[PDB]
Design a protein around this ligand. Structure first.
Ligand SMILES: CCCCCCCC(=O)O
Ligand SMILES: CCCCCCCC(=O)O
Lengths: 122, 122
């Protein structure tokens, strides 16, 4: 759910997940996908494409188990879909951390998302 | 769409809409509804219920025309659904303005939305 996703992003990046990524660029947070603004935005693009493959669980609402071991996200137990979901969320948390170097505040709070160029197919 | 909705909120409140309301409380921005945190949150509660009565258009991506006249939002659609949508968005913009006096920053950036108590039927 939004909670596990946000907590993962926080644990990896050290940044409040909702503030930095809740409405970032053309792909992060609210909305669907769009032409990525930067590398951070591309993380979210990939993430949303990851969500499309899921069958049997709801990435927005369903809760799942993971833990923090040796400063690493470790997906737990779960079933087929929740495991895949957990790994989706882990991957975007890692990707966002990896691209902190080019994170740009000017892409925060983008309620102009409807002006984004249409995203390519996943 | 998110653009018209954001702009209305900005025009009424004077505040960046995505920053203040993109992930606020249990009802504003990302996600569904939940037990309202405060009056600002209840505005968004009502708004999301308003969206449910819409038929013929899609509130998240559909563009529409309104104007700012005598510092008042004036909906300019002769499309029933888009008119209804416009009025939904106008009402929440006004409601948020009216409840600025109790707006609380601590409810901003709530990626803990899944812990919200379940919302009543609209
Ligand atoms: C707490 C907000 C987390 C933003 C999620 C970014 C990835 C996505 O939008 O798919
Ligand atoms: C970009 C501003 C987003 C705030 C929307 C608040 C109303 C709602 O959540 O239905």
């Amino acid at each position: 759910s939004l909670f596990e996703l946000g907590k993962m992003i926080l644990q990896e990046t050290g940044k409040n997940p909702a503030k930095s990524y809740g409405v970032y660029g053309c792909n992060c947070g609210v909305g669907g996908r769009g032409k990525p603004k930067d590398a951070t935005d591309r993380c979210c693009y990939v993430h949303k494409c990851c969500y499309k493959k899921l069958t049997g669980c709801d990435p927005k609402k369903d809760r799942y188990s993971y833990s923090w071991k040796d400063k690493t996200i470790v997906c737990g137990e779960n079933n087929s879909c929740l495991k895949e979901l957990c790994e989706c969320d882990k991957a975007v948390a890692i990707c966002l951390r990896e691209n902190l170097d080019t994170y740009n505040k000017k892409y925060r709070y983008n309620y102009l998302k409807p002006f984004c160029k249409k995203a390519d197919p996943c």
